[PDB]
């Protein structure tokens, strides 16, 4: 009964899904190439830059993103980068080892990510990972969640606010219609998914708080990390 995706929505789903799969670290081989961190600014310093770069590559493969002016692209990436990386770690939550996987390789514990420098944001990302188990999100659902965070019109300083809001509405309709098609065995699935979008948005602004607190002189922070704050 509930509306299933249109042809134009299936094309948008193909584009965004493939863009995610092509920029998701060790997509197939993440669980079998996992190295469990011993027992960490150092080891988390090394892996942040490639994680930002993958998010940049994801956005650069969305045609709608590429039609925006450079200064809007910069602001949109600043806004969603930690949100998208957090989501990507959270969907790689292993409930048996109670680890997240970063960069497809590094499995970390709640304690390691917390004392590694993230602080209470570590607890938020792990708690999101635990909640996202029973949601059983596929590559397409993760990609659309990412497109929705990327196309956020309330980022300060944005020029094409109206265009970005229009792009987001396309993704949200495609996303809801895919969720109808997918028929998850969870009640109020779509309302509950939008609450997760808020959880990632809260994680994005707490990263920004923790960042200002972590300032250690600035030259210790990797250059690209400083740019996306």
């Amino acid at each position: 009964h509930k509306p299933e995706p249109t042809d134009e929505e299936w094309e948008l789903i193909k584009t965004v899904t493939e863009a995610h799969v092509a920029t998701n670290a060790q997509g197939s081989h993440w669980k079998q190439k996992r190295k469990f961190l011993p027992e960490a600014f150092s080891h988390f310093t090394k892996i942040i830059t490639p994680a930002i770069t993958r998010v940049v590559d994801f956005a650069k493969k969305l045609p709608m993103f590429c039609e925006l002016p450079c200064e809007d692209q910069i602001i949109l990436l600043k806004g969603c980068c930690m949100e998208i990386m957090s989501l990507r770690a959270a969907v790689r939550y292993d409930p048996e080892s109670e680890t997240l996987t970063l960069n497809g390789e590094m499995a970390v514990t709640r304690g390691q990510l917390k004392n590694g420098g993230l602080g209470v944001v570590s607890d938020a990302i792990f708690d999101l990972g635990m909640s996202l188990s029973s949601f059983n999100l596929d590559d397409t659902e993760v990609a659309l969640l990412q497109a929705v965070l990327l196309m956020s019109s309330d980022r300060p300083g944005l020029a094409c606010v109206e265009r970005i809001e229009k792009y987001q509405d396309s993704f949200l309709l495609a996303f809801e219609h895919y969720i109808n098609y997918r028929k998850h065995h969870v009640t109020h699935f779509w309302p509950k998914l939008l609450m997760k979008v808020t959880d990632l948005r809260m994680i994005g602004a707490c990263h920004a708080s923790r960042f200002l607190h972590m300032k250690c002189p600035t030259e210790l922070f990797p250059p690209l990390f400083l740019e996306v704050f």
């Binding site: 940049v56 450079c70 910069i74 990436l77 600043k78 740019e227």
Partner: peptide, 11 residues
Amino acid sequence: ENALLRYLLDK
């Protein structure tokens, strides 16, 4: 600023 971000985007 944002020189490195700018570079990675315009590639």
